[PDB]
Design a protein around this ligand. Structure first.
Ligand SMILES: NC(=O)c1ccc[n+]([C@@H]2O[C@H](COP(=O)([O-])OP(=O)(O)OC[C@H]3O[C@@H](n4cnc5c(N)ncnc54)[C@H](O)[C@@H]3O)[C@@H](O)[C@H]2O)c1
Ligand SMILES: NC(=O)c1ccc[n+]([C@@H]2O[C@H](COP(=O)([O-])OP(=O)(O)OC[C@H]3O[C@@H](n4cnc5c(N)ncnc54)[C@H](O)[C@@H]3O)[C@@H](O)[C@H]2O)c1
Ligand code: NA
Ligand code: NA
Lengths: 339, 339
């Protein structure tokens, strides 16, 4: 209809969600909030991107508002969610892309002056429900006031896992994501914030860096029958964007590799994963997915079967752009369902 | 009692095999052949290294010979192996590290004028026997005139595979190696030599690049009971050296993770894999293994078990330095057994 969107935290995800939203005819961005940047600064970070190129349209400001392609967007600079007048901007759905309000109690604070619902741009730290478009978004209810769009990796893996589990049955699986660098990593060796994850504090540009991830386990929440049947981990490597899922799983039913390819192709061509999952049989590398909108691109030639029940599947994802498009689509999906 | 070594192809492996041979009194490098570098250029490439630091010692040349650590080394610049006078230079064992002579018929060209044996610094294209020190080098026979030291990845995987297979049994496994950049890759997008590996010719510094590899299947040759039970693939990523094995396997006997750790520690501490396999429980990243001599360093904290028979195990390797040490160790072992 028109999804009336607001964005909290104008970072990689906030700015790309903004761009995706601007591209859609059925979503409008009515407000932005980020206290670590002025208007001139926002204009700059929106104009230029080291990965996704120049903003496709003129960006400026006037009378305290951001002006993008003729449209005015209201701007706030509040540290604390409760102090953001979203209702006065007419915002309904909030993209919560700061990375630090990942509980219901915290995200709730956005909803006391007129806004309707919050979509977390990360997996929740509590039992907030996660949705992955094309996999379980039909489970959303209009009483789900706070929701999460999961992670980039979960959006890559869940669609592939659904197809394989539905057609052949996954007995058990272990996942690795070889993942692009992110904002929480450091340029040179130093202390990670909170002292959480020491490996993340080591020079990003010159290291392969192991990392924990709940993303495969999270597929167990998206696809309940796989709870306890999937987990995994990550290696962070020196590229600025684009990642790849490497899923090793045992199948319940024997398959030729061509049967798995056909099932993916079928899911990509029509039904709920059209525009979500895709495939390639070409000799692709990660830069080939810069600014690719899909959640998951199955790499036909990269995968390998040991035998007819034990297989290693490969699927690409632009962790930044794919995820940001899914989040906007989830916001729009909720807006339609809510009436 | 000295292994008289020659080096064909003075590359990453050639020059590091040279360093390793210089750190032991029971191996001498008597001659080097590389037709793509003058004597002056050889001195330069040996002096300086982007990953392993300056050569530790004076390098010069005099009367047509490379002069290192007081010793004189004979230098040739021949493209055709049959033109290299190994015999006259006093060479017995040849480190064949050019990348292009990986069949018996081709490697035999080194043995026409007085040399005894050739060691391929890569897996062969034919049925040439492969050996991994600490795993199956005792299968070596003095009649094996042409042999291979396998690959860096096989040297990292085989020791780990042996330990897990002997202690718990490997029903099946699939391996990924996240691998440092190599000389066969290109700096910017272009055509790979022979038009073979298209992905490998894509800009190395800005891509995660899938690659095929027989390194896991080769473990089935090193450890015959695992023939047909292991394979895998690789992703080449933008680091200059150091790689890591990610092995997903199904065990025959149930195990707690601590049992796998204990098994690896025992093998690292005494017996045939002392000096071959090691372990860490620290928050390491790839650069911590630059100039690490081990074939395989088990990363205790990076591993993850889904359940008591399905596990993902992680092991680091300095693909240049670990491998180069193993090759020299293999050449020496051969010289001793040959008498
Ligand atoms: N590939 C990806 O980059 C990716 C994919 C999926 C999910 N995510 C998740 O999305 C979230 C944001 O990630 P990102 O990559 O955009 O990080 P980022 O560092 O680029 O964005 C963070 C932004 O939030 C702003 N911010 C900080 N405190 C704020 C506050 N109190 N109020 C309002 N704004 C505030 C910062 O100024 C910054 O602009 C994280 O939870 C991350 O894990 C990232
Ligand atoms: N991580 C590694 O670099 C690594 C690890 C294990 C095995 N290997 C294998 O070892 C071999 C060498 O690898 P590298 O990384 O040292 O490659 P490299 O390109 O650094 O070295 C190859 C050298 O051989 C020389 N050469 C080319 N043609 C020759 C000829 N006709 N006669 C003599 N020399 C010639 C080149 O000038 C070059 O110096 C390859 O088979 C490779 O797969 C490499
Ligand atoms: Na729009
Ligand atoms: Na020596």
């Amino acid at each position: 209809m028109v999804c009336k969107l607001g964005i909290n935290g104008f970072g990689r995800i906030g700015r790309l969600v903004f761009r995706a939203a601007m591209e859609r005819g059925d979503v409008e961005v009515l407000a932005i909030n980020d206290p670590f940047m002025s208007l001139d600064y926002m204009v700059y970070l929106l104009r230029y991107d080291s990965v996704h190129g120049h903003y496709p349209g003129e960006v400026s400001h006037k009378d305290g508002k951001l002006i993008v392609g003729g449209k005015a967007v209201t701007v706030f600079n509040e540290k604390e969610p409760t102090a953001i007048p979203w209702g006065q901007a007419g915002v309904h759905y909030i993209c919560e892309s700061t990375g630090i309000f990942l509980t219901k109690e915290k995200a709730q604070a956005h909803l006391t002056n007129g806004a309707k619902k919050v979509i977390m741009s990360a997996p929740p730290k509590d039992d907030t429900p996660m949705f992955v478009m094309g996999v379980n978004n039909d489970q959303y209810k209009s009483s789900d006031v706070i929701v999460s769009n999961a992670s980039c990796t979960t959006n890559c893996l869940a669609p592939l896992a659904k197809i394989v589990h539905d057609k052949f049955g996954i007995v058990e699986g272990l996942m690795t994501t070889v993942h692009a660098m992110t904002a929480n990593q450091l340029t040179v060796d130093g202390p990670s914030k909170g002292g959480k994850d020491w490996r993340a504090g080591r020079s990003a540009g010159v290291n392969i860096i192991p990392a924990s991830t709940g993303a495969a386990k999270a597929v167990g929440k998206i696809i309940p029958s796989l709870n306890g049947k999937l987990t995994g981990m990550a290696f962070r490597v020196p590229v600025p964007d684009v990642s790849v899922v490497d899923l090793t799983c045992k199948l319940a039913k024997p398959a030729k590799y061509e049967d798995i390819v056909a099932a993916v192709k079928e899911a990509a061509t029509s039904g709920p994963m059209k525009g979500i999952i895709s495939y390639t049989d070409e000799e692709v590398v990660s830069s080939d997915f810069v600014h690719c909108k899909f959640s998951s691109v199955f790499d036909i030639n990269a995968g390998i079967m040991l035998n007819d029940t034990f297989v290693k599947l490969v699927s690409w994802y632009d962790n930044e752009w794919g995820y940001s498009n899914r989040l906007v689509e989830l916001a729009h999906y909720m807006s339609v369902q809510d009436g």
